[PDB]
Amino acid sequence: TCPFYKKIPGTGFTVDAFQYGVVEGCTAYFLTHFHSDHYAGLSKHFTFPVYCSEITGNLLKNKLHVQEQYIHPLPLDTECIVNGVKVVLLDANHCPGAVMILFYLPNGTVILHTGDFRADPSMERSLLADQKVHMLYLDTTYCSPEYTFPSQQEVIRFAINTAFEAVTLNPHALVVCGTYSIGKEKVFLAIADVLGSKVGMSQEKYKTLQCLNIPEINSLITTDMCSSLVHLLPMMQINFKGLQSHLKKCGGKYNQILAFRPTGWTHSNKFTRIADVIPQTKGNISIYGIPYSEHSSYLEMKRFVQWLKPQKIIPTVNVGTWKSRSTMEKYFREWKLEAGY
Numbered sequence: 001t002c003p004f005y006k007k008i009p010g011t012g013f014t015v016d017a018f019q020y021g022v023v024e025g026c027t028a029y030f031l032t033h034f035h036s037d038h039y040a041g042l043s044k045h046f047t048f049p050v051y052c053s054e055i056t057g058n059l060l061k062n063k064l065h066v067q068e069q070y071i072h073p074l075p076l077d078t079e080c081i082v083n084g085v086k087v088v089l090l091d092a093n094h095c096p097g098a099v100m101i102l103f104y105l106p107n108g109t110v111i112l113h114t115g116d117f118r119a120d121p122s123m124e125r126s127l128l129a130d131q132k133v134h135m136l137y138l139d140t141t142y143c144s145p146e147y148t149f150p151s152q153q154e155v156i157r158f159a160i161n162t163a164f165e166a167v168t169l170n171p172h173a174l175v176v177c178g179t180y181s182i183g184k185e186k187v188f189l190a191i192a193d194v195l196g197s198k199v200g201m202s203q204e205k206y207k208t209l210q211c212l213n214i215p216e217i218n219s220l221i222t223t224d225m226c227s228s229l230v231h232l233l234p235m236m237q238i239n240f241k242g243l244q245s246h247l248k249k250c251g252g253k254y255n256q257i258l259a260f261r262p263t264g265w266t267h268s269n270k271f272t273r274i275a276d277v278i279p280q281t282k283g284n285i286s287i288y289g290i291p292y293s294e295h296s297s298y299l300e301m302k303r304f305v306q307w308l309k310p311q312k313i314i315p316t317v318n319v320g321t322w323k324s325r326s327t328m329e330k331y332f333r334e335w336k337l338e339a340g341y
């Protein structure tokens, strides 16, 4: 059964609700982004209307085989009528194709569903500037002050400089980057660009990247591993055993691996600066964990919410424990008392 925080009152609509079967009263199923916890349940046998971005639509059609007649892509930043209700999709600054959804209810209420997002000051100049929001359905993944991490630009600066130094010292080093979902493509794309290489990967991952509308993509990626000195591998293979095994396959072309594991936050964030990050090393293999986040930090979240001044907040992450729910409610009340709404 579909939980309450996935239903939009006063409409026939659900958000990210595909794992509950036929939801009673649902006339349109919205999908915020192509991450498996959110699409869980979709397939070629789905026969209800799915509303989403163009990019999410490409992924539904090619990767999950959902039939074309049930895929409804909408442009961003554009007022659209869906089953007699005005909606707008906004860029969520998460993975490719990820949106927030603004719903203008027939009774006058306005609702924002963030999906998964990384809040940014640039959102204060979207179509959100123009009117009041009564209800906010909020991505609370990192809603606690301990969750600090650097900007995505600082993280990429660290990775490019680390890779370029290593391969310039040793032209026979291979760089490897882990992946297990869409998102974080700038990590491997930026490193390959500095090195003058395409990114090599499996046929399955190439297919996924080809759905993403990235400019000039044919110039940046390839299935021919031998021509490439940046390889992508599944995240599970980013360990000493998996990487040893990979270097054997390369036919003595390389004699060293430098590997990157993009994570979210880890408790080494509570003490160390990005500058000061060090790898795990065994022999000719070094592995860097880098904190490249596609979710808001606590401070970015707090800034957004204090600017939006919603009348009510419904968290969509960390909702399963009483301690989590209580902690989140406390911070929402501090923020409201501090800013005066």
Ligand code: NI
Pocket (backbone or CB within 6 Å): 033, 035, 094, 116
């Ligand atoms: Ni996500």
